[PDB]
Amino acid sequence: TKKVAIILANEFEDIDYSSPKEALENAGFNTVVIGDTANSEVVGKHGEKVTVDVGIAEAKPEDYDALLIPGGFSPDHLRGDTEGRYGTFAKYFTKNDVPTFAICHGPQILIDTDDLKGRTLTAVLNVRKDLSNAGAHVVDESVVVDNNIVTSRVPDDLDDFNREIVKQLQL
Amino acid sequence: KKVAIILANEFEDIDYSSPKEALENAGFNTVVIGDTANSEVVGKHGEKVTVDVGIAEAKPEDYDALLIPGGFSPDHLRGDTEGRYGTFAKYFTKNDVPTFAICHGPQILIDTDDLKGRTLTAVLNVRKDLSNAGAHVVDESVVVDNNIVTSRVPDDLDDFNREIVKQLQL
Q: For residue B101, what is the domain's CATH number?
């Protein structure tokens, strides 16, 4: 059975978490929330409470068949980790071409992999310039698939994003 | 001397209030520029601030400096569909006018495209993005690079406030 790592801090955009989680589980994949501390709670912009399953200190990225990075201000929080542990975690996925899915601000974390040169991505407007400075070919599309990396811009893109992430996992 | 403060919702309260009070104590005037004139924007910890001038009307030549408070306000500003806050900031970087940014504030300066070779600091969360914009990023309580003054976190405010006042007294 395949399972998806979802990296999550406080102030995630609630629907960026719930909608792809529901699509993945509906297709028969399981999800696991990876955050600062196992069994801590993180709270979305709009109040959704999510319990962290696995601490980032213990998490083995090779255990997971895909990474999902929900947006809002969760990715900014994750990039505040003094030891850069979420960037290092995401680097496993980009270095080994494992399916990697990011929506909205999510692609911010991919910048910390230093692996984006020549990759094609989209993101929320706020973050596109940073993605291009990181070496990406940034485009403005509802969903972008570049081999293993799937990106979308906003919650309104979720139908397209969810369809593509489940396909990539079927591979 | 008049200082433009560009501000959206979820600014870090003391990043606004503490420099604004330092500037006003030194005899300078501040003018909050935001999405719509006479709206209120609200800080992460609930401080309410009235927007004096809408970004659509603001003329950056009017001002003797630009101040960019941190929090998630700079991110919000970078979401403006027509990039009007980046364009506002470009006047200051192009014309070497005093430009002060704390915490996440320096994110806005990324949109000017004018950071190559410039020396800045910022909160850890945004340092990589500043480096990728070509800036020489250091980890100091305050950094002065000609016209641009940056600091990292609220603890640095004493040092920030001293340096931004000193810029304007020139």
A: 3.40.50.880
For residue A82, give its domain range: 1-171
In 3D space, the residue among B19, B133, B29 whose CA is nearest the CA of residue B68 turns out to be B19
How many C-beta atoms lie closer than 10 Å to residue B36's C-beta?
11
Domain count, chain B: 1
Say yes or no for a CB contact (<8 Å) between B75 and A79.
no
| Side chain identity, residue B24 | E
Q: Which residues of B touch A129 (CB under 8 A)?
A: 78, 110-111
Judged by CB atoms closer than 8 Å, whether chains meet at A80 and B124 is answered as: yes
Contacts of B122 in chain A (CB under 8 A): none
Which experimental approach was used here? X-ray
User: Which two three-digit tokens encode residue B116?
Assistant: 């190559």
Tell me the two tokens of residue A97. 């071409």
CA atoms within 13 A on the CB side of A170: 9
- B124 close to A (CB below 8 A): yes
